[PDB]
Amino acid sequence: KPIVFSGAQPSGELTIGNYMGALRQWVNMQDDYHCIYCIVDQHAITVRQDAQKLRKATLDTLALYLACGIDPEKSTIFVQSHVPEHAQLGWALNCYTYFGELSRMTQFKDKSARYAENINAGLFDYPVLMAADILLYQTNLVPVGEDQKQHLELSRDIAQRFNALYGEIFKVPEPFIPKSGARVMSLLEPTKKMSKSDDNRNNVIGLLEDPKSVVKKIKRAVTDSDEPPVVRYDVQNKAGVSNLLDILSAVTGQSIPELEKQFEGKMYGHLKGEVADAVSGMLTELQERYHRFRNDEAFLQQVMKDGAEKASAHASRTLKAVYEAIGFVAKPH
Amino acid sequence: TKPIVFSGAQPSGELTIGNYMGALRQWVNMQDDYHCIYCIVDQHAITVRQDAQKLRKATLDTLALYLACGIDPEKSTIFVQSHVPEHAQLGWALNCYTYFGELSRMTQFKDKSARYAENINAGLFDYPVLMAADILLYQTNLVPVGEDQKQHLELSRDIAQRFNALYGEIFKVPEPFIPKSGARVMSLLEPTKKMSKSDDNRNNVIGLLEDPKSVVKKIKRAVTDSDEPPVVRYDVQNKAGVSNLLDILSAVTGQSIPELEKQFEGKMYGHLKGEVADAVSGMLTELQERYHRFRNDEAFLQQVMKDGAEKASAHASRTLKAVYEAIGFVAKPH
Ligand SMILES: Nc1ncnc2c1ncn2[C@@H]1O[C@H](COP(=O)(O)OC(=O)[C@@H](N)Cc2c[nH]c3ccccc23)[C@@H](O)[C@H]1O
Ligand SMILES: O=C(O)[C@H]1Cc2c[nH]c3cccc(c23)S1
């Protein structure tokens, strides 16, 4: 049974796209793979932010993942900084990573533009820590979005390079190739995917938005001039309408041919009304689960404590072999 | 509580008399006056590719060399860097408070880049930040280092002040402790070049574990100025070889530079190199007798490492917990 590792940023404002795409897909596969979810608070601090907000967002992310169906009995979920092995292997893998490999990262060069005032060593060194995150757990599979592909490739390079010197210490991870299938596009830019990182929040529906705000953003979702207004799937002529159908279908399960006949003789106004109802209905159940988890501090502590302990048994095993291989004197027990 | 001293050396190569005069001598001298913590920085060592068996042996060699020099485990915390996870942990956190430019301007990074151009790795680049972590973890007041670590030490003051300015007095701002004499021991055949463990010309280098007979031969061959007449006078700029030899003899006898200048009045360089030779030969001979007694007792080495890591961890965890609270990490449930 393959080991899967995902990093969860304790700062991402997750959208319905995240939830009905990757998250829903992985929630349904917790018994097929040994899934590990790691809230990467050590990665987060490469971008400076309020300390209290980072603490709060670490817990928000924990409760949100739980509300989405991550089951801490089936999967391992934990906070990165709670397992010191991440930093430890992070340092040691620096010594097997070329400076040039890090310099050629587009994530570093792109994030240098956005944060030209904090081009800090953490921003530069992020891929090595990522590499350590993955390799500690003998990970077979990493779901990555497009802008993490090069980071995963470095991880595979580091694993192979390290193995070539010392033996099969790490598993070489593979990208998880199949995509969720749900199509959720930006509400004003329906050629671009709805993204949690959009600075234009009116493109997205965040997982915690209330129904009044959902209607606001859906009602302003772009449509087509087509006279008469016809609810028909056409990603090039009627993308906006096609996006609303795709989102509704992702919410309800109804097929696109079913939805077309559902809205036969209906206007663009009612289609948005049905989308908002379906989306807010979905978000209302997620939200009540979120707040039940989120307000239960003892529960969240127990999850964090149990997850870190599960992660640690694997992480320390790998780090022990790493340190033995590199040549350190073992810590006297 | 006494003010805290922290310093480290790599279990790489063979420690030199430069390592002794720039760092190790002051470490011994400070053990009573301050609370001293001394580290074998094996995680720093691996920034230069090392044979794994040699690295493990070098760690034990270095520890026995500390003990031979007079570092006393009942006065000083002595410990191996990789035995205290908090060094790696604070290293990462402080990465996020260090500017890329501060690391690319590092003289040591550039020098090691040219020398290990086949292994210009991120550890070599990130080196100063882990060093910063090594120091700041212990609320360190003083860092006894040679002159070549000054830039590294100054970055760690910058990092500490930068972090404190955001978060309160989490760290002490450390101060360098760099000796007036012997901060930059020079190469015997090229006294304009610092004496370096990695020198391929071994006639430049006095090894602390090297055969005293070979050391005497190298010191007798040390190059000296062409002053006419020869005069044994301390002048590091114009009389580099002679002054370096005066520093070295000073480090063995404890006589001041002016007492040695008065002692060598009417004496020439041949007599000088002879005295330095006999003095260093005596010191290394006694050093190596203590070295082997410590080094051949691996169970003692193991006990020192365990006691030291445990003493170090108590202090490092206390600092790391405060760092984690300040930057906003959820604390690990206990
Ligand atoms: N020719 C010389 N003359 C005088 N002093 C010299 C000479 N060559 C070396 N030194 C000093 O010896 C110490 C050990 O050298 P390292 O190369 O191990 O030094 C190094 O590699 C450090 N980065 C180890 C370290 C890691 N973390 C620390 C924290 C505090 C202090 C030191 C450290 C050093 O003090 C060095 O300045
Ligand atoms: O930015 C992101 O989402 C990445 C954050 C991250 C840190 N460590 C890992 C390991 C696997 C996958 C990811 C990460 S995804």
Q: Is A30 helix (H, G, I), strand (E, B) or coil?
A: coil
Rounded CA-CA distance A288/A303 in Å is: 19
Range A125-147 burial, b when 16+ CB lie within 10 A, else e: bbbbbbbbbbbbbbbbbbbbeee
Residue type, A314: H
Q: Is A52 helix (H, G, I), strand (E, B) or coil?
A: helix
How far, in Å, is the centroid of ligand 2 from the Cα of A8?
A: 6
Is any Cβ of chain A less than 8 angstroms from the Cβ of B107? no
Q: Is the peptide bond before B229 cis (omega within 30 degrees of 0)?
A: yes
Nearest of B67, B7, B11, B29 to residue B197 by alpha carbon: B11
Q: Which residues pair with B121 in a beta bridge?
A: A98
Residue B123 among known ligand-binding residues: no
Residues 6 or more apart whose Cβ sits within 8 Å of residue B226: none
The runs of H, that is alpha helices, within chain A are: 16-18, 24-27, 41-44, 51-67, 85-94, 99-103, 106-114, 121-135, 149-166, 211-219, 239-252, 256-262, 268-294, 297-326
Domain boundaries, chain B: 4-178+298-327, 202-292
Tell me if A327 and B91 make a contact (CB, 8 A cut-off).
no
Rounded CA-CA distance B57/A51 in Å is: 43
- Specify the length of chain B in residues: 334
Q: Count Cα atoms within 13 angstroms, Cβ side, for B219.
A: 27
Q: Is A207 within 8 Å of A64 (Cβ atoms)? A: yes
Report chain breaks in chain B, C–N > 2.5 Å, as residues after which they occur. none
Q: Is A77 helix (H, G, I), strand (E, B) or coil?
A: strand
Q: Is A3 helix (H, G, I), strand (E, B) or coil?
A: strand
Residue type, B111: D
Rounded CA-CA distance B213/B281 in Å is: 7
Rounded CA-CA distance A22/A27 in Å is: 9
Residues of B in Cβ contact (< 8 Å) with A53: 328
Positive or negative torsion for Cα A312, A318, A323, A324: positive
> What's the gap in Å between the CA of B182 and the closest CA on chain A?
31
| Tokens describing residue B182 | 């012997």
Q: Is B285 within 8 Å of B279 (Cβ atoms)? A: no
The topology (CATH level 3) of B202-292 is Tyrosyl-Transfer RNA Synthetase (1.10.240)
Q: For A276-317, give the DSSP string.
A: HHHHHHHHHHHHHHHHHHHT-HHHHHHHHHHHHHHHHHHHHH
Residues 6 or more apart whose Cβ sits within 8 Å of residue B265: B232
Residue A146 among known ligand-binding residues: yes
Tell me if A90 and B88 make a contact (CB, 8 A cut-off).
yes
Cα dihedral angle (A43, A45, A49, A53), rounded to 10 degrees? 70
**Whose alpha carbon is nearest atom 16 of ligand 1?**
B9
* Locus of tokens 């020439």: B268
Please state how this structure was obtained: X-ray
Rounded CA-CA distance B118/A36 in Å is: 36
Q: Which CATH superfamily is domain A201-291 in?
A: Tyrosyl-Transfer RNA Synthetase (1.10.240.10)
Tell me if A95 and B332 make a contact (CB, 8 A cut-off).
no
How far, in Å, is the centroid of ligand 2 from the Cα of A143?
A: 9
Residues of B numbered 304-323 whose beta carbons fall under 8 angstroms of chain A's beta carbons: which are they? 305-306, 309
Nearest of B129, B85, B130, B43 to residue A84 by alpha carbon: B85
Q: To which H or E segment does residue A6 belong? A: strand A3-8
Q: Is B309 within 8 Å of A331 (Cβ atoms)? A: yes
Residues 6 or more apart whose Cβ sits within 8 Å of residue A22: A143, A180
Nearest of A326, A318, A298 to residue A83 by alpha carbon: A318
Of A87, A124, A302, the CB nearest to B91: A87
Report the side by side order of strands in the sheet with B175-177.
Answer: B77-80, B35-40, B4-9, B142-144, B175-177
Rounded CA-CA distance A58/A78 in Å is: 10
| Tokens describing residue A292 | 């039940």
Q: Is A42 within 8 Å of B324 (Cβ atoms)? A: no
Rounded CA-CA distance A95/A88 in Å is: 12
| Tokens describing residue B282 | 């005596």
Is any Cβ of chain B less than 8 angstroms from the Cβ of A85? yes
Q: How far is CA A57 from the centre of its chain?
A: 14
| Tokens describing residue A163 | 């193995």
CA angle, residues B153, B154, B160, in degrees to nearest 5: 95
**Whose alpha carbon is nearest atom 36 of ligand 1?**
B146
Q: Is A146 helix (H, G, I), strand (E, B) or coil?
A: helix
Is any Cβ of chain A less than 8 angstroms from the Cβ of B23? no
Q: Count Cα atoms within 13 angstroms, Cβ side, for B178.
A: 16
CATH of B4-178+298-327, one of 3.50.30.30, 3.30.300.90, 3.50.50.60, 3.40.50.620: 3.40.50.620
User: Is residue A332 exposed (0-12), middle (13-18) or buried (19+ Cβ within 10 Å)?
Assistant: middle
Q: Count Cα atoms within 13 angstroms, Cβ side, for A242.
A: 14
Nearest of A233, A171, A125, A159 to residue B126 by alpha carbon: A125
| Tokens describing residue A125 | 């060194």
B182: left (phi over 0), alpha (psi -120 to 50) or beta: left
Rounded CA-CA distance B246/B232 in Å is: 8
Range A272-291 burial, b when 16+ CB lie within 10 A, else e: bebbbbbbbebbeebbeebe
- List the catalytic residue out of B150, B193, B197, B321: B197
Residue B198 among known ligand-binding residues: yes
Give the residue numbers of A marked as catalytic. 111, 193, 196
Q: Is A16 within 8 Å of A152 (Cβ atoms)? A: no
User: Is residue A93 exposed (0-12), middle (13-18) or buried (19+ Cβ within 10 Å)?
Assistant: buried
Q: Is A187 within 8 Å of A205 (Cβ atoms)? A: yes
Cα distances (angstroms) measured from residue B68 to each of A21, A329, B72, B209: 64, 20, 9, 11
Range A184-194 burial, b when 16+ CB lie within 10 A, else e: bbbbbbbeebb
Rounded CA-CA distance B332/A301 in Å is: 8
In SS3 terms, chain B reads as CCCEEEEEECCCCCCEHHHHHHHHHHHHHCCCCCEEEEEECHHHHCCCCCCHHHHHHHHHHHHHHHHHHCCCCCCCEEEEHHHCCHHHHHHHHHHCCCEHHHHHCCHHHHHHHHHCHHHCEHHHHHHHHHHHHHHHCCCCCEEECCHHHHHHHHHHHHHHHHHHHHHCCCCCCCEEECCCCCCCCECCCCCCCECCCCCCCHHHCCECCCCHHHHHHHHHCCCCCCCCCCCCCCCCCCCHHHHHHHHHHHHHHCCCHHHHHHHCCCCCHHHHHHHHHHHHHHHHHHHHHHHHHHHCCHHHHHHHHHHHHHHHHHHHHHHHHHHHHHHCCCCCCC
Cα dihedral angle (A79, B90, B98, B322), rounded to 10 degrees? 80
Rounded CA-CA distance A313/B248 in Å is: 51
| Tokens describing residue B120 | 């210009």
Cα distances (angstroms) measured from residue A11 to each of A50, A64, A105, B95: 11, 12, 22, 19
| Tokens describing residue B213 | 């007979």
Residue type, B135: I
Rounded CA-CA distance A317/B115 in Å is: 35
Tell me if B92 and A305 make a contact (CB, 8 A cut-off).
no
Q: Is A238 within 8 Å of A212 (Cβ atoms)? A: no
- List the catalytic residue out of B172, B194, B218, B239: B194
* Locus of tokens 């070539």: A164
Residues 6 or more apart whose Cβ sits within 8 Å of residue A321: A169
Range A3-176+297-326 has CATH code 3.40.50.150: no
CA angle, residues A126, A85, A131, in degrees to nearest 5: 35
User: Measured from the CA of B195, which atom of ligand 1 is nearest?
Assistant: 1
Is any Cβ of chain A less than 8 angstroms from the Cβ of B121? yes
Q: Is A80 within 8 Å of A8 (Cβ atoms)? A: no
Rounded CA-CA distance B250/B68 in Å is: 19
Q: Is A63 within 8 Å of A10 (Cβ atoms)? A: no
Residues of A numbered 182-241 whose beta carbons fall under 8 angstroms of chain B's beta carbons: which are they? none
Q: Is B249 within 8 Å of B279 (Cβ atoms)? A: yes
Mutation site for B-interface testing, chosen from A56, A328, A333 by largest number of B Cβ within 10 Å: A328
**Whose alpha carbon is nearest atom 27 of ligand 1?**
B131
Is any Cβ of chain B less than 8 angstroms from the Cβ of A115? no
Residues 6 or more apart whose Cβ sits within 8 Å of residue A173: A5, A134, A135, A139, A140, A141, A142, A152, A155, A156, A159
CA angle, residues B120, B40, B34, in degrees to nearest 5: 130
Rounded CA-CA distance A1/A314 in Å is: 15
Rounded CA-CA distance A86/B317 in Å is: 16
Name every protein residue with a CB atom under 6 angstroms from any ligand 2 atom.
Answer: A 5-7, 9, 40, 43, 130, 133-134, 142, 148
